[PDB]
Ligand binder design. Structure first.
Ligand code: NA
Length: 54
């Protein structure tokens, strides 16, 4: 799979900082298996949904 992960674009950064938010919104809003917040190389937080793994 080349497309396991995918940013949730314009996802609130404030929500990214809080437990469960990105994970459950990824599941709720995108039907994804999971999500997590990570920085990127420009050092800003993003919510990355994962469609392969829980
Ligand atoms: Na969490």
């Amino acid at each position: 799979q080349d497309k396991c992960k995918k940013v949730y674009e314009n996802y609130p950064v404030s929500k990214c900082q809080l437990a469960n938010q990105c994970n459950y919104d990824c599941k709720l809003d995108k039907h994804a298996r999971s999500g997590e917040c990570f920085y990127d190389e420009k050092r800003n937080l993003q919510c990355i949904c994962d469609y392969c793994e829980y």
